[model samples]
Target: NTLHEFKKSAKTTLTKEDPLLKIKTKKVNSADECANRCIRNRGFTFTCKAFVFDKSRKRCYWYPFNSMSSGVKKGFGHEFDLYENKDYIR
Candidate 1:
């Protein structure tokens, strides 16, 4: 996967608010594109380390931290699958 360095997890997600881990969001046709969104630093925070891709609406969420980040407290998300940068997770 060109979404290299990323590890995928299904039916799970990270906190998108509070501490503001989700710094960017946009529409993408597929999770692949969502990965591209994270890989490309342009127009997005350089610290992006994870994402939640919405399969139904083709939405992509970029986070500056991983699901394991402080206060994230990974939870169940029916519509999304999470992809986290391996480098960010232990």
Candidate 2:
């Protein structure tokens, strides 16, 4: 077993899941593009969590900011952003 071995497997998982679900990888440069793509197609109402390839949890999860505004961010409540490898700092 190798540390890098898991990395390759992770990518495989990403690709397979992407086509079936039509979810694209959220890269560092195109944060907005990925986020918009996620919301419009997936209908996810929360931030996303991005991961690597088939290394167990390598996925790019995307949710909406407005979704939390009323759910958790009401009156200074504790809110946890669940975006991806994009520009969201949470």
Candidate 3:
């Protein structure tokens, strides 16, 4: 696995309310497991650009960056966090 970078955000959801391209939507035991599953992601029409972790429920939401201007929307509960793929900066 290659080294990658992610931008962490608090209390956010996709601006569109739905994943640009959903890879998986499920629960895991920990953040490491959630990230591991997302890191193995592939097969989406767009590039995997972000992921959301539900701390309370251990759910992971893997999504894509189909466009150059995609972003997140605020107002989610504190238990939710969004991790944005910043690998393109490489």
Candidate 4:
């Protein structure tokens, strides 16, 4: 089965040092809003892999990889939270 919808249902956890694919950003107020934008932009040739929603900044960072393990980074803070693109994961 595949993830046909977008939600925070993925079973991945974030670590302070895991690198995530940061693609682009969308101007949104909430995490849900950012998530919906990602869903709307889903296309066969181009689809969002993951997102890092900055609650304080009210922005979303789109990525090209689904999980944190796709890459490794230094760290993130409470202002930012990572979200998986359910539609991109198999």
Specify the highest-lDDT model's number: 1
Q: After superposition, how far is residue 48 of candidate 1 from its true place, in Å?
A: 0.4
Writing each residue's lDDT as its tens digit, candidate 1 over 1-90 gives: 587768999888777458433357888888887787676755773777888898878888888788777777688888889999777778
After superposition, candidate 2 runs with Cα above 4 Å error: 1-26, 42-61, 64-68, 74-90
Candidate 3 steric clashes: 0
Backbone clashes counted, model 4: 3
Candidate 4: C-alpha lDDT: 0.58
Model 3: lDDT of residue 7: 70
RMSD of each: 2.1, 13.8, 4.0, 5.9
All candidates' lDDT scores? 0.79, 0.31, 0.62, 0.58
Scored by TM-score, the top model is: 1
Residue-wise C-alpha lDDT for candidate 2, range 1-90, written one tens digit per residue: 112111111111121212334443443333344444543445454444332222123334332332223332212112222333333323
lDDT of 3 by residue, 1-90 (tens): 332456777776655555443355777766555555555664345556777788988887776652234454444668888776776423
How well does candidate 1 match the true structure in TM-score terms? Answer: 0.84
Question: In model 4, which regions exceed 4 Å deviation?
Answer: 1-22, 42-45, 72-74
Q: Give each model a TM-score.
A: 0.84, 0.22, 0.65, 0.58
lDDT of 4 at 36: 64
Q: Ranking by TM-score, best first?
A: 1, 3, 4, 2
